[PDB]
Write a protein that binds this ligand. Structure first.
Ligand code: HEM
Ligand SMILES: CCCCCCCCCO[C@@H]1O[C@H](CO)[C@@H](O)[C@H](O)[C@H]1O
Ligand SMILES: [Ca+2]
Ligand SMILES: [Ca+2]
Ligand SMILES: [Ca+2]
Ligand SMILES: [Ca+2]
Ligand SMILES: [Ca+2]
Ligand SMILES: [Ca+2]
Ligand SMILES: [Ca+2]
Ligand SMILES: [Ca+2]
Ligand SMILES: [Cl-]
Ligand SMILES: [Cl-]
Ligand SMILES: [Cl-]
Length: 640
């Protein structure tokens, strides 16, 4: 046969593949071996992010395909259940069941986290090197480093607002204690701290024998405002006109008898997230008003269901084509992220002529069927690790004088600095009640986030009161930087270099491959006793030299590449059921005409961005100078 001869040639070409990929290679199809040869070839020459946009996009299409085929690992028995008719569930269910037309429990509350990379058992190394040493020497903020004008505090609030929709790990009842070693104890805000073990649930399989459970629905269903089950949904519903609870007077969240905010998920939250919850409750309630006017025969439950479909799709769209484009501020990713939604052919073509039929040309949104690449949808252990972005948070929020006349580029002066401790949890709700929605939002818009670099982890997070899932305070404080290191190890996520190999990225051989910062190299060498194989994932992701324009590492980005696409393409409500029958005509129109966070702010606060936002995106620092558009066609642009 020709297939056997070509496979022999593929075995010959194995001489051009990095030795660490020989294993994953044997598991690949013939065409995919050729594709890996091409991807790996580019990696060794001019890298994709230096290519003309159209070639960068071609590279990313091929790499993403490889990850879809080889970096999606199921965990646990698939919760298939008895066969059901998806037409019986033309709405987002309270616990995320009945979305995958073939598996009732996929994407539901308490489903298993899947994986992208094979697990690496680290139970004998949970404290090697010591996580409080790692936190002290490599993570704790020395001098604040910001993100320039690229990514403001609304953008930092937004990604946490998404984490509250996406991922949270079920805990066991067993307590763990970490103790600060003598060497760093005087630099540790806590000399020791206690927390709960992650719940390890047996799977019944050989390759992956235990898994974690996700207590948030992994569907992108806005469970951050709707809850992840019927009980928590019931708490937010008014049962009038489809609506959710909010203060009519202040536009802020309501609070329960303990002063805790009433929303979908408020765990370990802060004022910035509360602001976005309130904004999107206003969005949901505005959709209810529009649909109830159109049709007086719709009852509360009908209104709620349609408005949840519209609101959750608006959020997903804004994240995809506005937020991500600020995180990944390059021409290639502008083109790429917009293509996820609208296809390479573009919005104007799609809006005029409809979906072209392939994800490449028309976007994953509106595809005829959901796509899971043969692996039941989940968010993964690896996804959790790469979204650990706590260094985005500042030490203080800079509250501006919104009563002052805006200056050049709509700049405003500082009126007060507020410690982040005063803006988190219950205390933060009280502080926000005095500041108000407008002042907080404008101040967040004008303030840069922290950068994802070493030695930039807020020290206030090294002694925080953590919460139970309902937002209730725990008596045992945690050092979050040390805890994150422990969790990645506890949950068997590969450390940095093995993570790279698993994602067919060339591994580092020395610290100089990771970063040009000579003092950071010395710290890494100290903490890890020279061993790049012991380098923690979180540390590597913060340390890695950034592609120009990227706020995250390339290693994190490849997980974003595949998993962001997956959140849309696997979900019926973004694919087979993204249509006017399911959304209503007006509901679909609402999604299709909303392109940005600015559009939503302008809907509810009609004068805010005119007065105070000079940037194009509400996620960029608001007093940015005007920019003249690049006259070179997008798909032809060459990165400098
Ligand atoms: C005031 C703001 C925040 C506070 C107080 C906070 C606190 C916490 C705490 C206490 C945990 C759980 C640690 C554990 O027991 O395992 C956690 C987990 C996490 N946080 Fe934050 N965080 C905040 C903001 C953010 C931001 C801005 C991001 C950026 C993406 C983020 C991403 C995550 C992720 C991905 C997890 C892991 C969830 C899991 O284990 O499933 N957080 N955070
Ligand atoms: C799946 C892979 C898809 C993209 C592969 C692109 C191959 C690289 C093309 O090299 C060409 O010659 C130059 C030398 O001067 C390059 O550096 C330049 O950028 C490019 O135009
Ligand atoms: Ca969810
Ligand atoms: Ca009580
Ligand atoms: Ca009617
Ligand atoms: Ca003044
Ligand atoms: Ca300013
Ligand atoms: Ca030194
Ligand atoms: Ca519009
Ligand atoms: Ca006006
Ligand atoms: Cl519950
Ligand atoms: Cl994303
Ligand atoms: Cl759209």
């Amino acid at each position: 046969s020709m297939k056997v001869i070509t496979s022999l040639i593929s075995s010959i070409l194995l001489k051009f593949i990095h030795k660490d990929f020989h294993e994953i290679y044997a598991r690949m199809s013939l065409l995919d071996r050729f594709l890996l040869l091409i991807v790996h070839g580019v990696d060794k020459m001019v890298p994709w992010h230096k290519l003309p946009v159209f070639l960068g996009l071609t590279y990313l299409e091929v790499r993403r395909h490889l990850h879809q085929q080889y970096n999606l690992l199921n965990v646990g028995q698939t919760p298939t259940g008895i066969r059901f008719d998806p037409a019986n569930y033309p709405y987002r269910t309270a616990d995320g069941k009945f979305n995958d037309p073939f598996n009732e429990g996929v994407g539901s509350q308490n489903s298993f986290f899947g994986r992208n990379c094979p697990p690496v058992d680290q139970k004998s190394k949970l404290r090697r090197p010591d996580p409080m040493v790692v936190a002290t020497k490599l993570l704790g903020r020395k001098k604040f480093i910001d993100t320039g004008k690229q990514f403001n505090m609304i953008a930092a609030s937004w990604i946490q607002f998404m984490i509250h929709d996406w991922i949270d790990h079920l805990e066991d009842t067993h307590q763990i204690e970490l103790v600060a070693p003598k060497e760093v104890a005087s630099k540790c805000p806590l000399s020791s701290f206690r927390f709960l073990k992650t719940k390890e649930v047996p799977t019944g399989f050989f390759e992956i024998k235990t898994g974690s459970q996700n207590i948030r629905t992994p569907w992108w269903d806005s469970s951050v405002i709707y809850g992840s089950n019927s009980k928590t949904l019931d708490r937010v519903r008014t049962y009038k006109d489809g609506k959710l609870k909010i203060s009519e007077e202040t536009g802020l969240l309501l609070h329960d008898e303990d002063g805790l905010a009433i929303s979908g998920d408020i765990r370990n939250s802060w004022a910035g997230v509360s602001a976005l919850q309130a904004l999107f409750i206003k969005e949901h309630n505005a959709v209810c008003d529009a649909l109830k006017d159109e049709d007086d025969d719709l009852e509360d439950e009908d209104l709620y269901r349609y408005a949840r479909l519209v609101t959750s799709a608006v959020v997903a769209k804004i994240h995809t084509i506005d937020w991500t484009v600020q995180l990944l501020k390059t021409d290639t990713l502008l083109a790429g992220m917009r293509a996820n939604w609208y296809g390479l052919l573009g919005k104007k073509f799609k809006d005029s002529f409809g979906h072209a039929g392939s994800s490449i040309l028309g976007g994953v949104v509106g595809m005829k069927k959901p796509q899971n690449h043969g692996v039941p949808y989940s968010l993964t252990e690896d996804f959790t690790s790469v979204y650990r972005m706590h260094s985005l948070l500042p030490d203080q929020l800079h509250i501006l004088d919104i009563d002052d006349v805006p200056g050049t580029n709509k700049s405003l002066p500082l009126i007060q600095e507020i410690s982040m401790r005063d803006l988190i949890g219950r205390k933060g709700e009280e502080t926000m009640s005095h500041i108000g929605f407008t002042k907080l939002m404008v101040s967040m818009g004008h303030q840069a986030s922290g950068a994802l670099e070493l030695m930039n982890y807020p020290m206030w997070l090294r002694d925080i009161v953590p919460h139970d899932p309902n937002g209730q305070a725990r008596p045992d404080h945690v050092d979050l930087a040390a805890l994150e290191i422990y969790r990645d190890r506890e949950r068997s996520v590969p450390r940095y270099n093995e993570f790279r190999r698993s994602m067919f990225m060339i591994p580092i051989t020395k610290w100089e491959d990771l970063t040009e910062d000579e003092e950071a190299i010395e710290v890494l060498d100290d903490v890890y006793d020279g061993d790049v194989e012991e380098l923690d994932l979180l540390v590597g992701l913060m340390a890695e030299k950034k592609i120009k324009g990227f706020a995250i590492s390339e290693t994190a980005f490849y997980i974003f590449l595949i998993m962001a696409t997956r959140r849309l393409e696997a979900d019926r409500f973004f694919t087979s059921d993204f249509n006017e029958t399911i959304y209503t005509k007006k509901g679909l129109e609402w999604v299709n005409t909303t392109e940005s966070l600015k559009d939503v702010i302008d809907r509810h606060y009609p004068d805010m961005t005119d007065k105070w936002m000079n940037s194009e995106s509400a996620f960029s620092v608001w007093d940015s100078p005007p920019l003249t558009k690049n006259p070179i066609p997008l798909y032809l642009r060459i990165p400098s």
